[PDB]
Amino acid sequence: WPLSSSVPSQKTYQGSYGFRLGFLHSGTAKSVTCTYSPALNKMFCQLAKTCPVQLWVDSTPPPGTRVRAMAIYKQSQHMTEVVRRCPHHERCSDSDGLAPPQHLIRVEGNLRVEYLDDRNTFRHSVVVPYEPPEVGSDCTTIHYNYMCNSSCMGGMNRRPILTIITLEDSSGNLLGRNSFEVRVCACPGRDRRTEEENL
Ligand SMILES: [Zn+2]
Protein backbone atom coordinates (compact mmCIF):
# COMPACT_ATOMS: atom_id res chain seq x y z
CA TRP A 1 0.00 0.00 0.00
CA PRO A 2 1.13 3.56 -0.81
CA LEU A 3 2.40 5.65 2.08
CA SER A 4 0.85 9.05 2.73
CA SER A 5 2.92 12.10 1.87
CA SER A 6 1.62 13.85 5.00
CA VAL A 7 0.64 13.25 8.63
CA PRO A 8 -2.53 14.65 10.24
CA SER A 9 -1.89 16.97 13.17
CA GLN A 10 -2.69 15.53 16.58
CA LYS A 11 -2.42 18.87 18.43
CA THR A 12 -5.32 19.47 20.82
CA TYR A 13 -7.40 22.48 19.79
CA GLN A 14 -10.52 23.44 21.72
CA GLY A 15 -11.39 26.23 19.30
CA SER A 16 -14.28 28.68 19.37
CA TYR A 17 -16.79 26.12 20.65
CA GLY A 18 -14.67 24.78 23.53
CA PHE A 19 -14.56 21.32 22.01
CA ARG A 20 -13.32 18.35 23.98
CA LEU A 21 -13.91 14.64 24.43
CA GLY A 22 -15.42 12.64 27.25
CA PHE A 23 -15.70 8.92 27.94
CA LEU A 24 -17.88 6.82 30.23
CA HIS A 25 -16.29 6.16 33.62
CA SER A 26 -16.48 2.41 33.12
CA GLY A 27 -13.89 0.93 35.47
CA THR A 28 -11.85 -2.21 34.82
CA ALA A 29 -14.04 -5.19 35.69
CA LYS A 30 -13.27 -8.12 33.34
CA SER A 31 -16.76 -7.79 31.87
CA VAL A 32 -16.40 -4.23 30.52
CA THR A 33 -16.83 -3.81 26.74
CA CYS A 34 -14.97 -0.51 26.43
CA THR A 35 -12.89 1.30 29.05
CA TYR A 36 -10.91 4.56 28.98
CA SER A 37 -7.81 5.38 31.01
CA PRO A 38 -7.45 9.08 31.84
CA ALA A 39 -3.88 8.53 33.08
CA LEU A 40 -2.85 6.97 29.74
CA ASN A 41 -5.30 8.94 27.58
CA LYS A 42 -6.07 5.53 26.12
CA MET A 43 -9.23 3.68 25.18
CA PHE A 44 -9.27 -0.12 25.55
CA CYS A 45 -11.99 -1.78 23.47
CA GLN A 46 -13.05 -4.99 21.71
CA LEU A 47 -13.28 -5.88 18.03
CA ALA A 48 -16.56 -4.76 16.46
CA LYS A 49 -18.15 -3.73 19.77
CA THR A 50 -19.67 -0.40 20.85
CA CYS A 51 -17.15 2.25 21.83
CA PRO A 52 -18.87 5.38 23.16
CA VAL A 53 -17.11 8.71 22.65
CA GLN A 54 -18.63 11.92 24.02
CA LEU A 55 -18.48 15.36 22.44
CA TRP A 56 -18.58 18.26 24.89
CA VAL A 57 -18.82 21.89 23.76
CA ASP A 58 -19.05 25.18 25.66
CA SER A 59 -21.21 26.70 22.93
CA THR A 60 -23.12 25.14 20.06
CA PRO A 61 -21.37 24.83 16.68
CA PRO A 62 -23.36 26.17 13.72
CA PRO A 63 -25.76 24.01 11.71
CA GLY A 64 -23.97 21.80 9.19
CA THR A 65 -21.08 21.02 11.52
CA ARG A 66 -19.55 17.57 11.07
CA VAL A 67 -17.49 15.27 13.31
CA ARG A 68 -14.63 13.28 11.75
CA ALA A 69 -12.62 10.35 13.15
CA MET A 70 -9.29 9.13 11.72
CA ALA A 71 -6.65 6.71 12.99
CA ILE A 72 -2.89 7.12 12.72
CA TYR A 73 -0.01 5.07 14.07
CA LYS A 74 1.30 6.47 17.35
CA GLN A 75 4.97 5.73 16.68
CA SER A 76 6.58 8.44 14.54
CA GLN A 77 8.29 5.93 12.24
CA HIS A 78 4.94 4.46 11.19
CA MET A 79 3.01 7.69 10.91
CA THR A 80 2.95 7.93 7.12
CA GLU A 81 1.58 4.38 6.89
CA VAL A 82 -2.19 4.46 6.41
CA VAL A 83 -4.03 2.64 9.21
CA ARG A 84 -6.28 0.07 7.58
CA ARG A 85 -7.80 -3.33 8.26
CA CYS A 86 -5.73 -6.48 7.79
CA PRO A 87 -6.28 -8.64 4.67
CA HIS A 88 -8.21 -11.21 6.69
CA HIS A 89 -10.77 -8.70 7.93
CA GLU A 90 -10.80 -6.74 4.68
CA ARG A 91 -12.12 -9.97 3.10
CA CYS A 92 -14.40 -11.21 5.92
CA SER A 93 -18.18 -11.02 5.72
CA ASP A 94 -18.92 -8.42 8.38
CA SER A 95 -20.00 -5.57 6.09
CA ASP A 96 -22.72 -3.37 7.57
CA GLY A 97 -23.61 -2.22 4.07
CA LEU A 98 -22.40 1.31 4.79
CA ALA A 99 -18.68 1.08 5.62
CA PRO A 100 -15.79 0.41 3.18
CA PRO A 101 -14.34 -3.04 3.89
CA GLN A 102 -10.81 -1.63 4.43
CA HIS A 103 -11.80 0.98 7.03
CA LEU A 104 -10.74 0.37 10.64
CA ILE A 105 -13.20 2.79 12.25
CA ARG A 106 -16.96 2.57 11.74
CA VAL A 107 -19.91 4.39 13.30
CA GLU A 108 -22.98 2.37 14.30
CA GLY A 109 -26.57 3.53 14.77
CA ASN A 110 -26.35 6.51 12.41
CA LEU A 111 -27.67 6.34 8.86
CA ARG A 112 -26.12 9.72 8.05
CA VAL A 113 -22.62 8.29 8.46
CA GLU A 114 -20.23 9.09 5.63
CA TYR A 115 -16.88 7.45 4.78
CA LEU A 116 -13.91 8.96 2.92
CA ASP A 117 -10.83 7.60 1.17
CA ASP A 118 -8.88 10.84 0.83
CA ARG A 119 -7.72 10.96 -2.78
CA ASN A 120 -4.67 13.10 -1.95
CA THR A 121 -3.51 11.89 1.47
CA PHE A 122 -4.85 8.32 1.15
CA ARG A 123 -6.15 8.45 4.75
CA HIS A 124 -9.43 6.78 5.72
CA SER A 125 -11.94 8.63 7.87
CA VAL A 126 -15.52 8.46 9.03
CA VAL A 127 -17.75 11.49 9.49
CA VAL A 128 -21.19 12.14 10.95
CA PRO A 129 -23.32 15.27 11.36
CA TYR A 130 -22.74 17.06 14.64
CA GLU A 131 -25.95 16.90 16.66
CA PRO A 132 -26.37 19.04 19.76
CA PRO A 133 -27.04 17.11 23.00
CA GLU A 134 -30.59 15.96 23.65
CA VAL A 135 -32.26 18.42 26.02
CA GLY A 136 -31.25 17.64 29.59
CA SER A 137 -28.06 16.00 28.33
CA ASP A 138 -24.59 17.52 28.64
CA CYS A 139 -22.87 15.89 25.67
CA THR A 140 -23.32 14.20 22.30
CA THR A 141 -22.38 10.53 22.13
CA ILE A 142 -21.06 8.73 19.06
CA HIS A 143 -20.85 4.93 18.97
CA TYR A 144 -17.65 3.91 17.21
CA ASN A 145 -16.67 0.36 16.26
CA TYR A 146 -13.06 -0.72 15.69
CA MET A 147 -12.99 -3.51 13.10
CA CYS A 148 -9.53 -5.02 13.67
CA ASN A 149 -7.59 -6.09 16.73
CA SER A 150 -4.37 -4.27 17.60
CA SER A 151 -2.69 -7.67 17.16
CA CYS A 152 -3.97 -8.30 13.62
CA MET A 153 -1.10 -9.57 11.48
CA GLY A 154 -0.76 -7.71 8.19
CA GLY A 155 -2.73 -4.89 9.77
CA MET A 156 -1.91 -2.95 12.91
CA ASN A 157 0.30 -5.89 13.90
CA ARG A 158 0.67 -4.84 17.55
CA ARG A 159 1.55 -1.23 16.76
CA PRO A 160 -0.28 1.41 18.89
CA ILE A 161 -2.67 3.81 17.17
CA LEU A 162 -4.28 7.14 17.97
CA THR A 163 -7.78 8.19 17.00
CA ILE A 164 -8.03 11.88 16.08
CA ILE A 165 -11.48 13.40 16.44
CA THR A 166 -12.06 16.70 14.59
CA LEU A 167 -14.97 19.11 14.45
CA GLU A 168 -15.35 20.79 11.06
CA ASP A 169 -17.83 23.26 9.55
CA SER A 170 -19.98 22.41 6.54
CA SER A 171 -17.15 23.55 4.26
CA GLY A 172 -14.45 21.46 5.94
CA ASN A 173 -12.83 24.20 8.04
CA LEU A 174 -11.24 22.84 11.23
CA LEU A 175 -13.11 23.95 14.38
CA GLY A 176 -11.66 21.68 17.06
CA ARG A 177 -9.41 18.67 17.57
CA ASN A 178 -8.79 16.05 20.27
CA SER A 179 -7.19 12.61 20.24
CA PHE A 180 -6.69 9.44 22.25
CA GLU A 181 -4.71 6.23 22.04
CA VAL A 182 -6.66 3.03 21.26
CA ARG A 183 -5.96 -0.63 21.99
CA VAL A 184 -8.38 -3.11 20.48
CA CYS A 185 -7.96 -6.27 22.55
CA ALA A 186 -9.60 -9.39 23.98
CA CYS A 187 -10.04 -8.12 27.54
CA PRO A 188 -10.09 -4.30 27.88
CA GLY A 189 -10.60 -4.34 31.67
CA ARG A 190 -7.63 -6.54 32.46
CA ASP A 191 -5.44 -4.83 29.88
CA ARG A 192 -6.11 -1.32 31.23
CA ARG A 193 -5.50 -2.39 34.81
CA THR A 194 -2.26 -4.08 33.74
CA GLU A 195 -0.95 -1.16 31.67
CA GLU A 196 -1.70 1.30 34.48
CA GLU A 197 0.17 -1.05 36.82
CA ASN A 198 3.28 0.31 35.12
CA LEU A 199 2.77 3.77 36.63
ZN1 LIG B 1 -7.79 -7.58 11.34
Numbering used by the authors: 91 to 289
Anything the authors wrote about it?
This functional diversity and adaptability is provided through a complex domain structure, which comprises intrinsically unfolded N- and C-terminal extensions and linker regions that flank the structured DNA-binding domain (DBD) and tetramerization domain. Most p53 cancer mutations are located in the DBD.
In order to elucidate the exact nature of the interaction detected by NMR, we solved the crystal structure of a DBD construct comprising residues 89–293 at 1.68 Å resolution. The crystals belonged to space group P21 with two molecules in the asymmetric unit. The overall structure of the β-sandwich and the DNA-binding region, including the zinc coordination sphere, is essentially the same as reported for the DBD variants with a shorter N terminus. In both subunits of our structure with elongated N-terminal tail, the N-terminal residues up to Trp91 fold back onto the DBD, in excellent agreement with the analysis of local chemical shift perturbations by NMR in solution. A sharp turn within residues 94–96 facilitates this folding back of the N terminus against the L2 loop region of the DBD. The turn is stabilized via a hydrogen-bond network involving the hydroxyl group of Ser94, which is within hydrogen-bond distance of the main-chain oxygen of Thr211, the main-chain nitrogen and oxygen of Ser96 and a highly coordinated structural water molecule. The Cβ atom of Pro92 packs against the aromatic ring of Phe212. Key in positioning the extreme N terminus is a cation–π interaction of the indole ring of Trp91 with the guanidinium group of Arg174, which packs in an approximately coplanar manner, the preferred geometry in protein structures. For the two preceding residues, Pro89 and Ser90, no electron density was observed, indicating that they are highly flexible and do not significantly interact with the folded region of the DBD but point away from the structured domain. The short segment around Trp91, although not essential for the overall structure of the DBD, contributes to the thermodynamic stability of the DBD by folding back against a nonnative surface patch on the canonical DBD region.
